[PDB]
Design a protein around this ligand. Structure first.
Ligand SMILES: [Mg+2]
Ligand SMILES: [Mg+2]
Ligand SMILES: [Mg+2]
Ligand SMILES: [Mg+2]
Ligand SMILES: [Mg+2]
Ligand SMILES: [Mg+2]
Lengths: 50, 120, 241
RNA sequence: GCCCUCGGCCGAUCGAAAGGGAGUCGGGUUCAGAUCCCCGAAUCCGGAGUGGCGGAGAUGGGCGCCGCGAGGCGUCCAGUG
RNA sequence: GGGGCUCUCGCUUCUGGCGCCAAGCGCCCGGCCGCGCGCCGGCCGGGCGCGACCCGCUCCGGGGACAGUGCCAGGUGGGG
């Protein structure tokens, strides 16, 4: 509410403890549910990657 | 070679807490219980409604201390009248006095108890 | 040969995104309490900043051999404890009632302690060796002592531990101690100490006066400066020759 | 009691008789009270250390046997439906 | 062969799965029976190290003697 952009709820793995992390990214146009996004230096050039 | 920090947070270490071992009591003697049984049971109610409760519901109606709960009223009635009671209902009157309806156990007759108390 | 076939290795790899990281040592990356951070940062600041020579001279102290041998000499001259004083006072009272009289009986040489006592002894030139702790926290109690001892000619040294000097004088912490006259059997040991102390402290007082401290950068800064220097050096080397 | 290991509601506390929030209904009864009293039917939560009773787990299979046989005996093997 | 020399001193991209509380190895300390010659046989437990490299002085990064703050000075200032 109050924002024109959709928000993407994205679930990662905590690399240090057994848990699932939930982030609230700003949805880039094209991404869909069930899609894998990759965040990091070695990530590739795809829509939604960071 | 074994002191390790697997967490990046420093928490306050758990120290020893002693229990109080005072060198003198702050109160010389414990103050006695003012809300004893005679304080709890002030006087019975002798109105038309109270009499009808005695002769119908096996219930004695009392005016009790406003600070006494149902357990205290039950135990006080049991001790200072030598009767067994089933349940206690309690209201506070519009004048501020607490009223207790004490139903007696089936083997006790509230009429006879009221006669021994002297409130018939 | 007889090992159970059901036993097998189950190696886990700790690459990125794979099996979660093991519980490893994280002391370097701990959110420490403010007081721990403050004392460590103060230790770092005393290495960053240009420390004046009058404060920097206390970082030069005795080595293990000389400090231990000096403390061994000084252990023979510890001040008497309260129990020892009360017992010699009782013995003195009984023997005085017996007929011993005053009889000063050569009050034994003792170790004088305390900065005011020691500085008065130094001013009167009644001190034969001064030992100064290196870690007096309000360090103005001692900054004048090396220069004063040099001017008066009394040999002085700096030792590691106001706590060690305190244990020498049966207290928690002593700033400085002084050797007044010493016993005949210990005169040789005191002279042997005083000569090395004199060479290491009073003789080189002129360069102690000028030896500034600190002014050293952190390991990261030093390393990156070194790698920049090496880059320019290697390109210059390929240029030359 | 101490030690080892684990332990972020990461923020006290307050804030709704219309929000969220387990589980009570029928009949009778007073001058004035009743889903609260009486009668009769339920129900939720909490407790039970010495364990309250049952039922479930859990009571089978093989082989040597005894025994007219059934049924019992003994060595093994299973058994968190 | 192989070192001064380099990117690596990396382990995860076709799936709307799973993933923690160490397997393995090595060194020990107990209790048990016992060849009854000790590194000596087997059984019930516990500890440590490597697995999971070493050292280091700022947690990591971005600014930085500027910004900012304190005091004075000039300007602007119907916002009051
Ligand atoms: Mg009530
Ligand atoms: Mg917390
Ligand atoms: Mg509240
Ligand atoms: Mg409500
Ligand atoms: Mg009404
Ligand atoms: Mg005006």
């Amino acid at each position: 509410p109050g924002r024109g952009a959709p928000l993407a709820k994205v679930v990662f793995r905590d690399p240090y403890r057994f848990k699932k992390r939930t982030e609230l990214f700003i949805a880039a146009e094209g991404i869909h549910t069930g899609q894998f996004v990759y965040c990091g230096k070695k990530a590739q050039l795809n829509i939604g990657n960071v | 070679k074994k002191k390790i920090r697997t967490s990046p947070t420093f928490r306050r270490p758990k120290t020893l807490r002693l229990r109080r071992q005072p060198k003198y009591p702050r109160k010389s003697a414990p103050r006695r219980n003012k809300l004893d049984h005679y304080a709890i049971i002030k006087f019975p109610l002798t109105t038309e409604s109270a009499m009808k409760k005695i002769e119908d519901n096996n219930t004695l109606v009392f005016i009790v201390d406003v600070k006494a709960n149902k357990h205290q009223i039950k135990q006080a009635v049991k001790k200072l009248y030598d009767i067994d009671v089933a349940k206690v209902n309690t209201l506070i009157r519009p004048d501020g006095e607490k009223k207790a309806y004490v139903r007696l156990a089936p083997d006790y007759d509230a009429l006879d108890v009221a006669n021994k108390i002297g409130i018939i | 040969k007889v090992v159970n076939p059901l036993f097998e290795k189950r190696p886990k790899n700790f690459g990125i995104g794979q099996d979660i990281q093991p519980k490893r040592d994280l002391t370097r990356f701990v959110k420490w309490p403010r007081y721990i951070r403050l004392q460590r940062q103060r230790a770092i600041l005393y290495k960053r900043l240009k420390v004046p020579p009058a404060i920097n001279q206390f970082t030069q102290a005795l080595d293990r051999q000389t400090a231990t041998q000096l403390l061994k000499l000084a252990h023979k001259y510890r001040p008497e404890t309260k129990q020892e004083k009360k017992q010699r006072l009782l013995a003195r009272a009984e023997k005085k009632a017996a007929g011993k009289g005053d009889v000063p009986t050569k009050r034994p040489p003792v170790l004088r302690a305390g900065v005011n006592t020691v500085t008065t002894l130094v001013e009167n030139k009644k001190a034969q060796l001064v030992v100064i702790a290196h870690d007096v926290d309000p360090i103005e109690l001692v900054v004048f002592l090396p220069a004063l001892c040099r001017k008066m000619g009394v040999p002085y040294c700096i030792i590691k531990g106001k706590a060690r000097l305190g244990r020498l004088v049966h207290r928690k912490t002593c700033t400085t101690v002084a050797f007044t006259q010493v016993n005949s059997e210990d005169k040789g040991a005191l002279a042997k100490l005083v000569e090395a102390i004199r060479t290491n402290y009073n003789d080189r007082y002129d360069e102690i006066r000028r030896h500034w401290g600190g002014n050293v950068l952190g390991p990261k800064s030093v390393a990156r400066i070194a790698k920049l220097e090496k880059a320019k050096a290697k390109e210059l080397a390929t240029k030359l020759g």
